[PDB]
Structures are given as C-alpha cells and as structure tokens.
Design a protein around this ligand. Structure first.
Ligand SMILES: COc1cccc2c1CCCC(=O)N2
Length: 119
C-alpha cells in the first residue's frame, strides 16, 4: 500500500527500456532533419528521454500519467509508419509488449494503494 512506490518502479522499468535494443529509435526526440515532415503528422512528440526527465523532475503525479506518455511514443510510431512491416514500427510493437507486461503491476499496485489510502 505504498502510494509512492511507483516512481522507483518506473525508473527501473525505464532503465530496462534504455538497455533494450528495440528502444534505440525512441530514446531521444525525433530529428526533424532526418524526418522533415514528422511535425505535419505528429501533433505531440514524445520520446523516452522526455519521459525520464519528466519523472525525474517530479512532474508526474501518478504512473497513469507516465503510461499515457509512453503509449503516445507507440501511437506516434504507428501514425508515422509508412508500413505495418517497417523496421522502426516493428521495434515499437515489441517494446510496447515489453512495457505493457511490466507496467501492469505498477498500475495495479498504485491504484490499490490509493484505494486503501481513501478507505
Ligand atoms: C521518438 O521516436 C519516434 C516517435 C514516433 C515515430 C517514430 C519515431 C522514431 C523515428 C521516426 C520514425 O520513423 N518513427
């Protein structure tokens, strides 16, 4: 029932994500010089360095907010891909499966702790 435990859990999950080779395209904001039209398609850019910095700044109140930003990295990849068989998109799908598998207990434990707090 520790309401703050999610933060270190998210830090450790982001560390695992940065070790994953599949996170390479998503570790830093997309380079507009490499993808000139990216901002015509993507309204809200997101990347794992921005997620980590937001977390470390104390600018996430809950793991749901972090999860929303991580899911935005994956939905941006899907929206920008020219093909469902593209390399970067294919990496995003494996990374998303790994993220979802690991964030599930973080979210469940936080929501349970908060329900206990408000009992
Ligand atoms: C954070 O990096 C993202 C985010 C959304 C979409 C993509 C990428 C990587 C490079 C550009 C790309 O092909 N797709």
């Amino acid at each position: 029932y520790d309401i703050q435990a999610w933060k270190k859990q998210c830090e450790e999950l982001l560390n695992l994500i940065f070790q994953c080779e599949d996170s390479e395209p998503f570790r830093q904001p997309v380079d507009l010089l490499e993808y000139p039209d990216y901002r015509d398609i993507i309204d809200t850019p997101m990347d794992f360095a921005t997620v980590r910095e937001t977390l470390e700044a104390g600018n996430y109140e809950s793991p749901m907010e972090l999860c929303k930003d991580v899911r935005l990295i994956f939905s941006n990849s899907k929206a920008y891909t020219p093909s469902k068989r593209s390399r970067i998109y294919s990496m995003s799908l494996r990374l998303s499966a790994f993220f979802e598998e690991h964030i599930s207990s973080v979210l469940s434990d936080y929501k349970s702790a908060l329900r206990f707090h408000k009992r």
